């Protein structure tokens, strides 16, 4: 129960909390909702069990730029928000707000807990699951451990699982001493060797400076593609001996590349890979959260599957020199760049692929929305796995673009993942 140190991620993510910096002043948050008709008392105290597991759901973040795992916290209870009686316009108004209050909410540095879990009662057994949580407390792939051992617990509430023996104190240990070792000056030599031709963001269109924002409030564009066309999506990245991964990213910079007329640009890519320092590594909740700026060169006489291909070497070369994070080398960037206290690389493509594995929260019900706000970030397109289908959501500063415009963007990258889906290939970038 020491204090022991942040990842570089979350120290980034610490100090995007600070108003004095452009697109700052606040702290990267998930927000999901599901239609629920579980018992939300079993529910609550099989989440009491999962809060028991795993200690980073017992942890705090303290002003000092360090986490701590609590000797003994509350008892938590899902709330349970009443609201039979009534009408569906009045529900849908208190549903709407409560949504815009759970969003702009900021969980206070060194106090439990981080996150919230609250029902509202739409009928006798029908609830809305409303789920949040910061992201200093855990990444997206350990939101998934959570709901797994949730409804683990709910089902089988006896059946006791097998004790961890590895802790995310223990693998910051391990982190802290990652940063000083041969691999780590090696994958440092590498992103300094790209750093004077590497490409800048792509320059979109902004509605105004980002320095004139202030608080940046985030909007959510989502869709689901059927299993039918994300089956027909992965059989096409296998046949054309690529990634679901780099195949989606290179979509992704079409679409950049097309609305910022450029041909190079950097992608900041999210990812959660888990460095193989222990036997139970992926089974303990944390942040393992990993940067790399994807270097993608678009307007090329190349076909597009071609461009997938050098996405594809790009991505792992960035994988085996992940040791220095994005984090670093987006400061290298902005210090050899001359580029001032502004967001340099916001352009975000967030990977939770599963390799066709389950989505334990479905397992809940029916999810109704998702947002995800971050610091510094002007764009963050987030695919998520969903127990075969993919589900698409893209997060954008809304004070930044025009919705119009930010529609069509989606609608085209959604509209070129058809267009593989039909012909294996996609027409000359028009206009949606």
């Known amino acids: 129960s020491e204090p022991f140190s942040l990842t570089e991620v979350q120290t980034a993510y610490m100090l995007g909390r600070n108003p004095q910096f452009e697109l700052s002043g606040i702290s990267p948050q998930t927000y999901?909702?599901?239609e629920t008709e579980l018992d939300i008392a079993r529910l609550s105290r099989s989440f009491q069990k999962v809060i028991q597991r795993h200690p980073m759901l017992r942890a705090v973040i303290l002003p000092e730029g360090k986490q701590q795992i609590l000797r003994d916290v509350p008892e938590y209870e899902i709330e349970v928000e009443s609201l039979v009686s009534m009408p569906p316009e009045k529900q849908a108004a208190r549903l709407r707000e409560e949504r815009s209050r759970m969003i702009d909410h900021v969980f206070?540095?060194?106090?439990?807990?981080?996150?919230?879990?609250?029902?509202?009662?739409?009928?006798?057994?029908?609830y809305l699951l409303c789920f949040?949580?910061?992201?200093?407390?855990?990444?997206?792939?350990?939101?998934?451990?959570?709901?797994?051992?949730?409804?683990?617990?709910?089902?089988?509430?006896?059946?006791?699982?097998?004790?961890?023996?590895?802790?995310f104190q223990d693998y910051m240990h391990i982190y802290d001493d990652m940063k000083r070792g041969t691999e780590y000056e090696t994958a440092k030599a590498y992103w300094t060797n790209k750093l004077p031709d590497?490409?800048?963001?792509?320059?979109?269109?902004?509605?105004?400076?980002?320095?004139?924002?202030?608080?940046?409030?985030?909007?959510?564009?989502?869709?689901?593609?059927?299993?039918?066309?994300?089956?027909?999506?992965?059989?096409?990245?296998?046949?054309?001996?690529?990634?679901?991964?780099?195949?989606?990213c290179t979509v992704y910079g079409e679409v950049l590349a097309f609305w910022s007329n450029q041909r190079r640009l950097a992608i900041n890519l999210t990812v959660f890979n888990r460095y193989p320092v222990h036997d139970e590594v992926e089974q303990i909740v944390?942040?393992?959260?990993?940067?790399?700026?994807?270097?993608?060169?678009?307007?090329?006489?190349?076909?597009?599957?071609?461009?997938?291909?050098?996405?594809?070497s790009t991505l792992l070369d960035g994988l085996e020199h992940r040791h220095y994070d994005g984090v670093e080398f987006i400061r290298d960037y902005?210090?050899?760049?001359?580029?001032?206290?502004?967001?340099?690389?916001?352009?975000?493509?967030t990977s939770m692929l599963a390799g066709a594995g389950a989505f334990a929260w479905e397992e809940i019900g029916s999810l109704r929305h998702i947002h995800a706000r971050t610091p510094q970030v002007y764009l963050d397109n987030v695919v998520i796995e969903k127990n075969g289908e993919l589900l698409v959501s893209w997060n954008y500063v809304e004070e930044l673009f025009d919705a119009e415009v930010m529609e069509s963007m989606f609608t085209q990258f959604v509209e070129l993942l058809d267009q593989l889906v039909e012909q294996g290939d996609i027409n000359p970038l028009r206009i949606s």
């Open 334 to 349: 902005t210090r050899y760049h001359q580029m001032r206290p502004k967001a340099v690389m916001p352009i975000v493509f």
């Open 108 to 126: 206070p540095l060194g106090q439990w807990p981080l996150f919230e879990l609250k029902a509202f009662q739409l009928q006798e057994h029908t």
């Open 286 to 312: 944390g942040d393992f959260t990993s940067l790399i700026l994807l270097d993608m060169d678009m307007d090329q006489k190349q076909p597009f599957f071609t461009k997938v291909e050098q996405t594809q």
């Open 198 to 248: 590497f490409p800048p963001a792509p320059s979109l269109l902004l509605a105004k400076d980002p320095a004139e924002i202030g608080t940046p409030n985030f909007q959510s564009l989502t869709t689901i593609i059927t299993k039918d066309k994300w089956l027909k999506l992965r059989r096409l990245a296998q046949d054309k001996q690529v990634t679901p991964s780099a195949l989606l």
């Open 32 to 34: 999901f909702e599901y």
């Open 132 to 167: 949040r949580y910061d992201a200093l407390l855990m990444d997206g792939a350990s939101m998934n451990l959570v709901g797994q051992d949730l409804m683990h617990y709910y089902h089988q509430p006896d059946a006791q699982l097998p004790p961890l023996s590895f802790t």
